[PDB]
Amino acid sequence: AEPGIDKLFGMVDSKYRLTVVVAKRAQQLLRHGFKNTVLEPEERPKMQTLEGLFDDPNAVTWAMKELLTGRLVFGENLVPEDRLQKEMERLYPV
Amino acid sequence: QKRKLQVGDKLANRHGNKGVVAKILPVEDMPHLPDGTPVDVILNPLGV
Amino acid sequence: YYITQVRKEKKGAGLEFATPEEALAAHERGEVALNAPIKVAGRETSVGRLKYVFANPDEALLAVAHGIVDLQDVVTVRYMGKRLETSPGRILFARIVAEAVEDEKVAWELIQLDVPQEKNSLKDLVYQAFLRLGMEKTARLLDALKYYGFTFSTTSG
Amino acid sequence: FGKRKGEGFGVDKREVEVLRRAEKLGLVTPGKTPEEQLKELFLQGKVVLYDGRTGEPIEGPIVVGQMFIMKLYHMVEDKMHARSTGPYSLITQQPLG
Amino acid sequence: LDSKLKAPVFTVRTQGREYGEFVLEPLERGFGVTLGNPLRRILLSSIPGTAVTSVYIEDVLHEFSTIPGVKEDVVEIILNLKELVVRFLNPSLQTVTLLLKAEGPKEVKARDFLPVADVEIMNPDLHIATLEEGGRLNMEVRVDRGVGYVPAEKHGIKDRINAIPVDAVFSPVRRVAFQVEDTRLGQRTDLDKLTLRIWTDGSVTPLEALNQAVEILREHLTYFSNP
Amino acid sequence: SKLKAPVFTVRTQGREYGEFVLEPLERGFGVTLGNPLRRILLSSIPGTAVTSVYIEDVLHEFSTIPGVKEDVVEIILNLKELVVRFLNPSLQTVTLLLKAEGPKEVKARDFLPVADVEIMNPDLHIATLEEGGRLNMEVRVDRGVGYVPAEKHGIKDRINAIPVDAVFSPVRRVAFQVEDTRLGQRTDLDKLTLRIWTDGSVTPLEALNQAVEILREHLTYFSNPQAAAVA
Amino acid sequence: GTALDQRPRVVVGQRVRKGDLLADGPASENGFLALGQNVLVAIMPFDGY
């Protein structure tokens, strides 16, 4: 099972809402190169290459991690869509 | 092409018993007899 | 099922004894079988429970490791402050459940000890584990029951 | 087995353990000698087997025999298939089957 | 055809004097169990330890007798005694008798045992018995040095006429469990990764216990040498 | 009460078969020793095998030579069973030549002999040749470990060379007995017998020693621990 | 796509009576119906495999 999936289902009021939260977050991180992560250097998901450990590329792994840390606000009608898009492009370039 | 036997090939007997090769263990893992002779195939009694 | 079954033997067949030492001596004479039911004094117990008493489950398994008894032999064990009459097989089952879900107390509460583990009981174990500990842990318990069930089937003979 | 007794080998310890097992299984008559009992088992088409990984015998006796097994035509070499993208249909423009 | 293997890496993970995990990867196919089963046998049968082999308790006739003044029965005190981890500090030592006299309202621990030269009680907060008002407990416990596990009725040793023989838990090891996983080395597909797990009592540590085990075998390899 | 070194009996019957008794050993240890030795003796014991065949006027494995009863497939099945002993330890690889013809049942003796090379089953049938039937082989035989399929080692000494399955391990069987024995007042001691059969390329005793050596070398690996960086 | 070939089963000069076997076809062992192998079999569970 997914690391900490019972807590994740506890977080939302409908399992599919968690699914949409995870997918949206993972796309937000794919878009900015993970420069917007709420995870600390020590909490980064790692992938064990043949050379050595590197950042995990699976942005849905990153999404569910960040979700368990509590450092994200998820909900409906939080902010205008192009306002969020341009503020994220301002803070973390592409 | 000379086809050896691989994982996924289907074996069967004349009595209805059929099934796929799932595992090829090396000779040192096979159940063997007191005199050292290893068995060839390990069928599961749960079918019978 | 094979490990958590208990043996039922016919040699003893319900003899009466006064002191446990008389019963152990009788079993020594080959007169009574280890797991046959007898009645020492007014108590109806078995030679195996007296002859063999274990302070903790590790000891039970160390004995089964050394040939002393077998997992289906009924024996006496001290597990969680309790002086249980049960097999080392059922002790092992419960250890598998308990290490699987990483909660010895909840684990003990979940099992039915004094029964062979079958389809129905294992089923109710998974329903109960689901409800109590969650699906991540029930998946770990399931890989667990899977592992041992296959291992113990192989050598079960 | 007379091969074995002539070659100079007694009843191995593990055959003892399995014999006591099969005795509790009502498979042998108790008190008979190990040869008497192993013959009894064999006649039921069972033998002693030693887990090749451990050295230890199977907790009990196991049926072992010569069997006619056939290779059926359905080999995995012929069925493993996978496509990223391929050809499409004319009217529907969906992939071929 | 042409094979170029490399000698594996040995990895250790200990939690105190009680527990150790050991991962040795990569191993050519089949060698995971080739190393695992022996070391397990050795680690449960032939690691030298200490065990409470016999017990004398005053005015206590047999093992299934009662003790007036104490709430535990005799069997129970004998079990609690099975759980005592005693460690010989002098390699010469071979056997000790340990005496313990207490009375009145009190809960005897392993501390109450009278200290001896070259004898360390590793688990002194261990519980033996609680006595009441008028409860009197005089007992002598025999503690030897052996390997493995001996039922009480297999050594039968008696100092005196009323000494109870006690199943002897020699092994400082309480469990060994090893598990091999398939692991890959570039193009090599079927290599083995040996994970070993060792629970001790604290007299010996896991790493010490395993090193002792590997020694016995290495030494048994030398017995194939001069006919 | 601590046991001590046991007595080591060795009963060899030629280069093929050997019994290796050890007594007395502590209870259980009959197995603790006898099984890993088995496993290392069924696999990881080096030996030799035919790895390539070139025949004259044979382009590939599914041919038939005129004047020859056997098909090439069958001939490689025969040639697999060839036992070829290397007397020199520096030697890695040998290309045996065979030229034969006429009414004659070619056997493994007919190979042109090489020094530091001995065919341990010269009576091994290979082919049945007919009036006018010829045969000109060049087989390549290598050292090696275990079982290396043709589809992997791909050994071709030339263009029409056939790669062949190589069963390198020269151990043809390993059984081990644990009998009951006593020493003084000790009961239930184990008496370890190891029956070993080989092909003659290496003898049972040499086999057992290299297996010993492998197991000991393997115990060497635990000697340098390392910290676990999981934390 | 199975291979159908025949193999000689007699050698030069063998006197053969009427109906004697001169060649083994596909899946034929000295004239018997060879649809497989006779292997050595143990009927016991095995680790889930």
Next chain:
DNA sequence: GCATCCGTGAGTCCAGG
């Protein structure tokens, strides 16, 4: 109120040929 005639439907995926 009944027969009577009409059309419409009748498991999934996979291989070949």
